[PDB]
Design a protein around this ligand. Structure first.
Ligand SMILES: Nc1ncnc2c1ncn2[C@@H]1O[C@H](COP(=O)(O)OP(=O)(O)OP(=O)(O)O)[C@@H](O)[C@H]1O
Ligand SMILES: Nc1ncnc2c1ncn2[C@@H]1O[C@H](COP(=O)(O)OP(=O)(O)OP(=O)(O)O)[C@@H](O)[C@H]1O
Ligand SMILES: Nc1ncnc2c1ncn2[C@@H]1O[C@H](COP(=O)(O)OP(=O)(O)OP(=O)(O)O)[C@@H](O)[C@H]1O
Ligand SMILES: Nc1ncnc2c1ncn2[C@@H]1O[C@H](COP(=O)(O)OP(=O)(O)OP(=O)(O)O)[C@@H](O)[C@H]1O
Ligand SMILES: [K+]
Ligand SMILES: [K+]
Lengths: 216, 429, 429, 216, 216, 216
């Protein structure tokens, strides 16, 4: 129930700002004074501390915390030492930001509980939307199956959900339609799809792109 | 343990002292539990207050125990500890305690200060006391003369306050020998051993340390204020100083300006003073004399620093500076800690005693201040104190002498949090 | 300059006030030179002491002049100046004075604070005073009822101390309406306008400023200490609170814990209290309540800061920190300046008065503290003061209300030395 | 009218110093402490503040100012952010210093009310005086028409205002003559022009330079 | 004996830490505040001081110390000046860390009592163990004669002490055997030597390596 | 009466230190805190001040000084500005240290009263002693005439002054002889000159070197 965010980056600072908005107990830690001062208002607490020094980490009473997040992603030395301290101090959940494949490897071996590549992950997702101008957003259920949010082209304007079937033709299923902000969850055929309306499809990754090609 | 060792060792020589004084050989008329501890404490904490008269109640033996404890407390528990070992070396662990005991920031040749201070003490104690106080005090014979002339020196130099006979020296209001020889002793004992060693070594008006410079000019001008104050206020008042020759009006006005920090000798009775003078004497004995030293509650320099600091702030120069050598921050905040602690304690003593006793207010107030300031002066509650009131004056005498800080540091949990925290806006105006 | 303008303007409304009160229409029995100035000063400096009784000596007209001056001093000379202009805009030069007047570090929308504080004042003054203090006060009729119910609010909210009738509200020791409605008014008036605006706006236990947080928890726990203190001490004492039902023993113990900072209303007599309680009440009224504010000498926060600073030092953490948001240095040194100045002035008032007057000591001491703290409480020298003693209480009331700092800053030569000086070693221990 | 000068440059500092000498209300703002301290005496008011932080700008009570001048010309990031804040906070008149054409463009798009290039402007004016050693000072009425102050050569010493007419001959008009400090405004023909007197002519830019060539 | 360690390096800090664990009187000196704070707990005493300034060294009361160790090995200027001060101030024993041959030379000439190259020394010892995978540890009695600790190969597993003699065959003498942690000092023939058991031999350096070749 | 040394260099610091040893009134000024602290003991006064800021110079009460020495020789900007201030503030005697020919020129034009090149001057004097191993020390009376102190070679051991006349033979005059520390001022012929004795000759620069060649 208690959270500690060490490293008030753009990533770290967003976690401490969000968790606090959700109304949790969050300790904001950073070696830079100016960063601490800034997040003072957006955290249950703010403290200037060098997370690589043990006595400084004990002074925070770090052992109190259920979840500690190390969002230091530029300094590998700072990150690895901190996480090692946290593991040595028996913190239950240690979530760390990694810089690259190698930093991930060091963290893995010193027992970080969950490792995140916020930039690389958001990279591939944005790249997908660049390459395929139709995909607005998506979530992968596995390597093969995925739920995709698609911007409807004029190729679908005033088309019927029963008429242009996805279930029989492509083996995919339409989950939602968003026309002018209004949302039709679990839509019943037939329904009108206008141009620029958010279409949420679900199925095999290859199957969807086949629908994208031939349907749109 | 440097703070604790100072405290436990000091407390022990009071217990040692009390048991020695409660012992038959030292008492003429059987002595109380509380009073043996009180009188012992007051000699060893160089205070000057006594529930029981010294000249009457204590045998020649007990009066020597009194001198010993006065000698012990006046120079410092550790100073002798070092001398014992020296004569019997010398560890850093020891040099650490000595530095703490002589309130020094550096451990730099601090044993050289112990060497000087002791040798200089017994030197001026002997030559001035035995010799000069025997040329005009063999009118008590030899067995009385040579012992009362010596006792009064060890009491004088160490800022004790303990006079052997019932008049705490009122008898000699005019006598120049007793006036001079006793002021010479209790003012130079007062100002820093720093100041003595520095004046002895450097020898020039110019080449004196900031401390020494501040002490020499500070003690001079405050004395000159207080004398003018005591004179102007107690001039008319017939009770004291009203019926004295224009010359003896000085020897009294001088003495009462000079004795409150922190000697404790009476040239005039303090009970019969215009309340204004007493008020002034309160302040004058909150501020001790010097930080070396013989005794104080919050020492003269501390007062300058804090005052000059506020003065500076009000101008306001960004940094507090005296004599065109600026005063670092860690001094200000220590000064602010010495200051607050001492005053808060004195306030609790006053609050306690107006619950612990039925008596006049001003008399309790003067009593607390003089107890903490290890002064020794009373408008006279001292004999009239409740058994409980004696206890809490004993405490206040213990803390006041040892230093209000090093007392706290004995039971203080030393916590060094390395982490900092964001700024916090807080109005103080 | 900003400090001078505050000072000269404030001093003027006292002169204005005095001439208005010395005026026939306001007096039943002809009034003195000194007394017209004293009573005027005490209303406009929101002190609460009066040489001449308010209910008897002053006409309904003069009592409205009293309310006006109380209103003026309680909210702030400049606050009205700004309102006058507002209603008649608004310059930076003006915003500068207002910031200074409301003791603010920033000039940030400070007129928005003036807007709020005034509207909130007359709002709670009206609704609580007129309405609620008429529920149980038209047993004086209408011409007496509606005017005495109103007067007491303006006096309450602004921490005046001025009660219309001879019993400074002893009459109502038990009456819950007068107890609550008047404490509600004088405590919330006390704590920062900062604290009021902050509580009104932010509305949540957590999202309060470090000031507001300190004030809300500070005022609560000190009140709870003082009530326990007043109860335990004055419980047995028959003179006050001895002869009261276990319930009314609270309403009195509560009220006397709460009124010293800096209201000035009597639920019991202060003359007849075990001296201990009075001692405690001295400290409790050196520390005012809040810095916004209605009035204080050195204000509650200042006390915390300096204390918590020394506590911190003694540990010693390198930085002084409360609520895990650390306190910057410029706050500490201002606190140390507010603190020293106020105490030194109070000491001079005490020293002066023991030479200005023949009277008991504790009574002078309580009197000076209550004058500087703009408290209003006496064991009763107030009517018994010498013409000279009234003067020096008038001064002490002027400085105490205006702030001991901004007074100095009115005649302070602002000197900016940009050069630094070498370090200077100075012992304070 | 209340003024706020953010950035106590050589340019900014000159505005606060002047406006204050004129006796206006001027707030001097700078992130550098030493700069604030320096202009303390030369401003209605001086404050250390980082103009890019919003809360710090509100602390100044910036919304209380009619005119705010951003004389940060070296830091583009500082300047653009500050001006954006000022526009967002609904300041009526925002006058900014620009570094170059591109900085001008960003300021333009974020709604700076008037943009100034003090160096480039003074550059071209000084260059004119370098190239044409005769022109002491000038002011452009438009792109084509201009009022020019000229140093008189020996080619004009003891010449009569009318005798050497510019009005008929060149289509320009002489407005003033300054001989040994004494000033003759709207001079009546004939008047004596000595060498090194200040001659103030007015007309077409090309016309004046033709007079400069043939007359002087 | 009173000890002063100037320079809380990895080397200096280890001396202070050890001497203090042994319970001696040790003064820890360093110009870096953070270093002093760190070793506070691991020294009789810690002080921030610049060892090159004389008055600062006297303030420590350096003349009090029997042994002063200058473990500044990166800064030659700091080291040489400090040691020169110490010699001038008549310290009986001055032990200094050197960087290289030349630094050693300067220290030699300014009267350092004992000079140590902790890195170079440990270098050659570790190199020996790298080259000869059999030698675990050793101590040189002279340039020619040495006591060596050897890891026993399968070439010695269940071999008897007298059986595989060195006292006759190679002119060396076996001093100890360590099997599974148990230690047999001055072992009496015959004794069982298992594989991976620590064998402590003593003799000529060349003789031992001849035994290493033919015996193991 | 009163001296002010701005810039506590090796040069400046030597002037303050000497003048103070002579027991004059000397104000030691330096922008570096550490330098001021160091010379505190060796000056009538020490003050941290930036000599280029006017108000800071007035705070010292610089106008109180008869002689002000600017021993800033590395920073040309600091030196020139300071000296300009001093001249503007009507200091009677301004003695400045120069870096090079050009810095000398700037100082000359802004009215420095005496300019010194301590290094260049000591350079040429030391070079003379290098080139001519015989000359120990000298002082130039003019460009042509000079007093020279010479170390006597074995070429003069047990020679009489009148016997080896410098006067008649070379047009120079011997002024002093220093044998084993004992000094014979204005010596009377004949006197014994041993080897390695200090011989003080006086005359023409060319004449002396002719004696050096043929006599020694
Ligand atoms: N040893 C440390 N102790 C405490 N805080 C640290 C330490 N090292 C770095 N930080 C802080 O943690 C954060 C480390 O983030 P770093 O910015 O420098 O790159 P980053 O993780 O990629 O940033 P971002 O989250 O914006 O992508 C910074 O806020 C930094 O101030
Ligand atoms: N974020 C900021 N907030 C307030 N002041 C700032 C900020 N950033 C820079 N300044 C100040 O703005 C001032 C203007 O200087 P600026 O360096 O950026 O160069 P400049 O415009 O080329 O100077 P100049 O006007 O002399 O030509 C400086 O004193 C600088 O310290
Ligand atoms: N003048 C000085 N006085 C006191 N301590 C100093 C001084 N100068 C440097 N030091 C300290 O001495 C040490 C300098 O030695 P150096 O750290 O840079 O490492 P090293 O001796 O080469 O090897 P190692 O770090 O492994 O011990 C540092 O810890 C430094 O803080
Ligand atoms: N603005 C300044 N005002 C006063 N003193 C300064 C100022 N700037 C530099 N100094 C000091 O004046 C002194 C001048 O020294 P500078 O190093 O820069 O070279 P230097 O004079 O040739 O040194 P040296 O005298 O040893 O040959 C230094 O102590 C320097 O710190
Ligand atoms: K005493
Ligand atoms: K009041």
């Amino acid at each position: 129930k208690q959270f500690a965010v060490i490293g008030l980056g753009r990533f770290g600072g967003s976690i401490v700002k969000e968790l606090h908005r959700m109304g949790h107990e969050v300790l904001a830690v950073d070696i830079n004074e100016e960063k601490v001062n800034a997040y003072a208002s957006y955290a249950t607490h703010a403290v200037i501390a060098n997370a690589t020094e043990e006595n400084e980490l004990l002074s925070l009473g770090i052992r109190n915390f259920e979840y500690v997040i190390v969002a230091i992603g530029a300094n590998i030395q700072a990150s690895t030492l901190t996480t090692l301290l946290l593991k040595e101090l028996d913190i239950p959940n240690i979530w760390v930001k990694a810089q690259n494949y190698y930093h991930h490897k060091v963290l893995e071996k010193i027992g970080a509980d969950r490792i995140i590549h916020p930039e690389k992950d958001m990279g591939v997702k944005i790249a997908q939307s660049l390459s395929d101008e139709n995909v607005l957003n998506y979530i992968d259920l596995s390597d093969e199956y995925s739920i995709v949010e698609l911007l409807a082209t004029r190729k679908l304007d005033s088309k019927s959900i029963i008429d242009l079937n996805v279930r029989a033709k492509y083996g995919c299923t339409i989950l939602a339609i968003k026309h002018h902000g209004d949302i039709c969850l679990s839509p019943a055929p037939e329904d009108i799809i206008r141009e620029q309306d958010c279409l949420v499809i679900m199925g095999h990754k290859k199957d969807i792109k086949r629908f994208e090609n031939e349907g749109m | 343990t440097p703070p604790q060792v100072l405290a436990i060792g000091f407390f022990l020589t009071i217990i040692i002292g009390a048991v020695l004084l409660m012992l038959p050989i030292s008492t003429t008329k059987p002595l109380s539990w509380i009073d043996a501890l009180f009188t012992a404490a007051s000699a060893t904490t160089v205070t000057g207050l006594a529930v029981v008269d010294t000249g009457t109640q204590f045998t020649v033996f007990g009066q020597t125990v009194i001198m010993g404890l006065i000698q012990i407390g006046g120079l410092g528990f550790m100073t002798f500890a070092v001398l014992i070992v020296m004569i019997l070396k010398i560890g850093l662990k020891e040099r650490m305690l000595v530095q703490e005991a002589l309130n020094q920031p550096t451990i730099g040749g601090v044993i050289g200060l112990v060497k000087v201070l002791f040798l200089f003490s017994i030197s001026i104690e002997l030559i001035a006391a035995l010799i000069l106080s025997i040329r005009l005090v063999p009118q008590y014979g030899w067995s009385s003369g040579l012992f009362a002339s010596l006792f009064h020196a060890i009491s004088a130099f160490n800022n004790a306050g303990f006079s052997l006979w019932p008049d705490n020296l009122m008898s000699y209001v005019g006598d120049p020998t007793v006036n001079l020889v006793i002021t010479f002793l209790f003012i130079t004992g007062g100002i820093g051993f720093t100041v003595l060693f520095d004046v002895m070594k450097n020898r020039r008006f110019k080449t004196f340390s900031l401390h020494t410079k501040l002490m020499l000019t500070g003690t001079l001008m405050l004395n000159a204020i207080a004398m003018l104050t005591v004179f102007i206020l107690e001039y008319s008042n017939p009770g004291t100083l009203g019926h004295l020759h224009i010359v003896d009006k000085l020897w009294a006005s001088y003495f009462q300006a000079v004795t409150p920090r922190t000697a404790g000798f009476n040239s005039l009775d303090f009970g019969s003073m215009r309340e204004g003078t007493i008020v002034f004497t309160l302040l004058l004995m909150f501020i001790g004399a010097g930080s070396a030293s013989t005794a104080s509650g919050i020492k003269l320099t501390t007062f300058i620093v804090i005052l000059t600091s506020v003065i500076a702030y009000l101008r306001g120069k960004k940094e507090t500076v005296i004599f065109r050598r600026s005063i670092k921050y860690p001094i200000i905040i220590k000064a602010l800690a010495v200051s607050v602690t001492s005053l808060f304690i004195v306030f609790l003593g006053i609050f306690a005693l107006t619950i612990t006793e039925q008596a006049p207010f001003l008399q309790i107030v003067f009593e607390t201040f003089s107890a903490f300031g290890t002064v020794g002066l009373t408008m006279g509650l001292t004999p009239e104190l409740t058994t409980a009131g004696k206890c809490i004056i004993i405490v206040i005498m213990f803390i006041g002498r040892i230093g209000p800080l090093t007392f706290v540091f004995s039971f203080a949990k030393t916590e060094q949090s390395n982490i900092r925290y964001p700024d916090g806006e807080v109005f103080t105006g």
